[PDB]
Design a binder for this molecule. Structure first.
Ligand SMILES: *[C@@H]1O[C@H](CO)[C@@H](O[C@@H]2O[C@H](CO)[C@@H](O)[C@H](O)[C@H]2NC(C)=O)[C@H](O)[C@H]1NC(C)=O
Ligand SMILES: *[C@@H]1O[C@H](CO)[C@@H](O)[C@H](O)[C@H]1NC(C)=O
Ligand SMILES: *[C@@H]1O[C@H](CO)[C@@H](O)[C@H](O)[C@H]1NC(C)=O
Ligand SMILES: *[C@@H]1O[C@H](CO)[C@@H](O)[C@H](O)[C@H]1NC(C)=O
Ligand SMILES: *[C@@H]1O[C@H](CO)[C@@H](O)[C@H](O)[C@H]1NC(C)=O
Ligand SMILES: *[C@@H]1O[C@H](CO)[C@@H](O)[C@H](O)[C@H]1NC(C)=O
Lengths: 195, 596
């Protein structure tokens, strides 16, 4: 009876930026889907293609946990068939996604009076991201017709920007921690079932 | 990529970077205005410096995007505001003069000294000096002492400076290619590039003149009634076919006729409605005022206040040693931070001001989805005409019964409607000619039809024929009388107080039409009405994304400013006034003078 490392995921001391979202691989363990449905401390808990209860007894090959931190108004963009900055340049989901999305407020941790500048996101990119792709490049975005030479200037911008969370902001501008759980079903013994 | 989508990329960076620096300036100002201290003046200065530097730097860089190669209206609107230089077109030699002139004018207006003759002992200045003197007094000589003391010193010390203030502010506006400084002011109302909704700068003048021609009868009857009741307070010195002397009209300049109510009461022995006693008798605190102003907007159509508004807003005076500047304001700090700073007692004026200040907040939450540069009212009169029709419905003797403050057996006599209508006419109908005349004077001075030596001559001839006010003592070409007012010394526009007045009555009749109200318009109440709230929100949500003509048409169904709803509001009073003036002369002869 090996319990899956859900505490290391939901209870991590520090999370990651959106353009560098964290991926954890869960396999060969017993998963307890009882501290997630029962816990009425989650602001958003939505599953696509799988019923939360009842279907919590089906075997899967591999499980993936993707963790990051966004702002309140952007949580709606973590869903299939959605457009925006986060969905197109930061984190993209496939149309046929099968998994769950969980998001909860983290104002008391990720906000500071002087401003939390440790969190970043991408504003400019040449083209949209393919599903489950991560881009941590820092080349200057060349919007004009002159070479940027890796230095910012007229029609040349640094692609990364900071959220700057503060305690007195509104609900839509407060930080939200997001964890997305994906289930893999392949031609494998699928040693991850859970009671 | 072409120019348009490059400007679109530039504006994304600008909007991301501007919202961060605007929050620190607003919060630093809030800290000062809520807690005055020596060290809380440096943070405000630093934030204001950073914001101004960023704005200037980004305005310099945004002038390499020609407008002629752009077809989308939204990006054009966002670029026009940012591209405008302002006063930087002036040479640095001509830029060290104008700010110095303005600061000297502000200081000399603030630091006044009125001392009675042959007695250098006591001097009372403007606040709370001559303002209190010219608020409650019935002596001709005392009232004709403060009116000439202010114009003798300040005017004679602002005439030489103002003459320069005109010549520079025109040339700047001539470098910005606008014909002069008056047309620069009138450019606020300009709409271009929309078929059927365009509006030129010069058309505002004609639209203003036409409206004033349909208010003359009511103002003449009010003027005649006030003149008839001012011959008894002062047994003489007033002629029955003449102009009212300037020093007998409530406040100093004659901007409001409110303080003449004690002398002009339609039906005495019948007191007005006041619910201060009811509040103070059954334990009304400072929050219940702000808890019932919420249930009004919530009742009609609108969302409730945020949690941060109930914990980050100063709603009651702090007292003790900590100092707070009391002035009712409504702050939009950005990032969903709305708060109100006002110290409130338990009275009726505070109750009605609460609705005003909450309407201001409720207009701000609607256009928070627009880009940074398009978050404001449609023009300079839409934002104080929306927060003011909410005080029109929170004072009727039907809303008050429904909340438990006006006795549930109260009767509505028609000898009290006239008393409430004159209180409301001494403030609305008795200030429009003054605003019109002052702005027309400024327009002619800026254009050039008024030569420098016939300045004070034309002032006291438009006082004769437009307002009906005569010199108590004649003035030569050494004073600057308009400079004695606050908005003339300090550079401000003054037409926004006219159009707003005409807007607030166009809105109400529209909303009261959606509430199926029956009876007089002044007895209307938009409560529990889900049809008026949606119509109001369908104008509140836009901001500056669309021309003010379209936003106005969204609510009232007309593309232009109109005066008929204002005349509908004041109808019974008109009949009463016309009936009670069968033995007087309506109008004033422009020959009679107190000094002969
Ligand atoms: C994260 O850590 C907490 C504390 O160690 C775990 O315990 C729960 O904490 C929540 C409040 O944060 C309580 O409402 C629950 O009753 C606690 N449960 C138990 C069994 O103590 C919490 O379970 C951890 N998170 C996860 C996903 O395991
Ligand atoms: C007001 O400002 C002073 C700064 O000298 C500070 O010590 C004090 O705590 C402040 N009070 C409040 C109520 O913010
Ligand atoms: C103008 O730009 C805005 C912002 O990109 C866009 O939403 C709008 O559709 C554009 N106008 C037209 C007519 O497409
Ligand atoms: C406003 O109303 C919503 C529901 O419409 C409610 O959840 C919220 O608590 C209310 N806010 C306040 C301050 O009462
Ligand atoms: C609106 O509804 C409330 C609900 O109690 C009621 O008290 C109030 O009188 C209503 N307003 C009007 C104008 O009737
Ligand atoms: C008030 O109504 C009564 C009854 O119709 C009428 O006689 C009286 O003249 C009215 N008062 C005024 C000021 O019109």
């Amino acid at each position: 009876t090996n319990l899956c490392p859900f505490d290391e995921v939901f209870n991590a001391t520090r999370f990651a930026s959106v353009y560098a979202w964290n991926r954890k691989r869960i396999s060969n363990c017993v998963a307890d889907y009882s501290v997630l449905y029962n816990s009425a401390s989650f602001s958003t808990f939505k599953c696509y293609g799988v019923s939360p209860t009842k279907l919590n007894d089906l075997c899967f090959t591999n499980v993936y946990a993707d963790s990051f931190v966004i702002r309140g108004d952007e949580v709606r963009q973590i869903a299939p068939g959605q457009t925006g900055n986060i969905a197109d340049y930061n984190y993209k989901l496939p149309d046929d996604f099968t998994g769950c999305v969980i998001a909860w407020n983290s104002n008391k941790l990720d906000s500071k009076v002087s401003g939390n500048y440790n969190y970043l996101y991408r504003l400019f990119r040449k083209s949209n991201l393919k599903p489950f792709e991560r881009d941590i490049s820092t080349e200057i975005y060349q919007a004009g017709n002159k070479p940027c030479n890796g230095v910012a200037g007229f029609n040349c911008y640094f692609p990364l920007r900071s959220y700057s969370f503060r305690p007195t902001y509104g609900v839509g501008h407060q930080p939200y921690r997001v964890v997305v759980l994906s289930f893999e079903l392949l031609h494998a013994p699928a040693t991850v079932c859970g009671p | 990529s072409t120019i348009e989508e490059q400007a679109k990329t530039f504006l994304d960076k600008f909007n991301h970077e501007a919202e961060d620096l605007f929050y620190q300036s607003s919060l630093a100002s809030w800290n000062y205005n809520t807690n005055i201290t020596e060290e809380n003046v440096q943070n405000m200065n630093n934030a204001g410096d950073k914001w101004s530097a960023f704005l200037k730097e980004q305005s310099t860089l945004a002038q390499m995007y020609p407008l002629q190669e752009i077809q989308n209206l939204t990006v054009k609107l966002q670029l026009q505001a940012l591209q405008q230089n302002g006063s930087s077109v002036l040479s640095e030699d001509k830029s060290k003069r104008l700010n110095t002139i303005l600061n000297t004018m502000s200081t000399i207006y603030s630091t006044g000294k009125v001392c009675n003759p042959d007695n250098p002992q006591e001097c009372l200045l403007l606040e709370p000096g001559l303002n209190e003197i010219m608020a409650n007094s019935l002596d001709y000589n005392e009232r004709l002492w403060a009116w000439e003391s202010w114009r003798s010193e300040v005017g004679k010390q602002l005439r030489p400076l103002y003459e320069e203030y005109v010549v520079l502010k025109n040339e700047m506006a001539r470098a910005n290619h606008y014909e002069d400084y008056g047309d620069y002011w009138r450019g606020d109302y300009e709409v271009n590039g929309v078929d059927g909704y365009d509006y030129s700068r010069g058309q505002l003048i004609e639209d203003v003149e036409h409206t004033f021609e349909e208010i003359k009868p009511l103002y003449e009857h009010l003027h005649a009634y006030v003149r008839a009741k001012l011959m008894n307070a002062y047994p003489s010195y007033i002629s029955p076919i003449g102009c009212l002397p300037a020093h007998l009209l409530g406040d100093m300049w004659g901007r409001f006729w409110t303080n003449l109510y004690s002398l002009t009461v339609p039906f005495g022995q019948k007191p007005n409605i006041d619910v201060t006693d009811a509040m103070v008798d059954q334990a009304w605190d400072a929050q219940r005022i702000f808890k019932e102003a919420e249930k009004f907007f919530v009742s009609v159509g609108l969302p409730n206040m945020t949690q941060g508004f109930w914990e980050n807003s100063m709603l009651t005076d702090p007292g003790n040693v900590q100092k707070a500047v009391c002035h009712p304001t409504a702050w939009d700090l950005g990032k969903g931070d709305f708060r109100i700073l006002m110290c409130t007692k338990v009275t009726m004026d505070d109750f009605l001001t609460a609705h005003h200040e909450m309407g201001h907040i409720q207009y701000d939450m609607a256009y928070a989805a627009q880009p940074f540069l398009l978050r404001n009212g449609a023009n300079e009169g839409f934002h104080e005409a929306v927060g003011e029709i909410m005080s029109l419905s929170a004072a009727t003797p039907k809303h008050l019964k429904s909340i438990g403050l006006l006795s549930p057996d109260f009767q509505e006599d028609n000898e009290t409607e006239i008393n409430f209508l004159l209180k409301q006419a001494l403030t609305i109908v008795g200030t429009l000619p003054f605003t019109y005349m002052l702005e027309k004077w400024r327009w002619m001075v800026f254009k050039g039809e008024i030569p420098k030596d016939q300045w004070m001559k034309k002032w006291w001839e438009m006082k004769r024929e437009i307002v009906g006010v005569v010199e108590p003592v004649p003035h030569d070409e050494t004073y600057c009388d308009p400079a004695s007012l606050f908005h003339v010394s300090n550079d401000y526009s003054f037409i926004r107080y006219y159009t707003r007045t005409l807007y607030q009555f166009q809105f109400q009749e529209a909303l009261c039409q959606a509430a199926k109200h029956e009876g007089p318009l002044h007895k209307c109440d938009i409560s529990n009405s889900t049809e008026a709230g949606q119509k109001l929100f369908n104008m509140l949500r836009l901001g500056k994304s669309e021309p003010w003509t379209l936003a106005l048409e969204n609510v009232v169904g007309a593309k232009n400013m109109n005066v008929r709803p204002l005349l509908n509001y004041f109808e019974p009073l008109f009949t009463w006034l016309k009936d009670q003036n069968k033995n007087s002369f309506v109008g004033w002869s422009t020959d009679w003078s107190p000094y002969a």
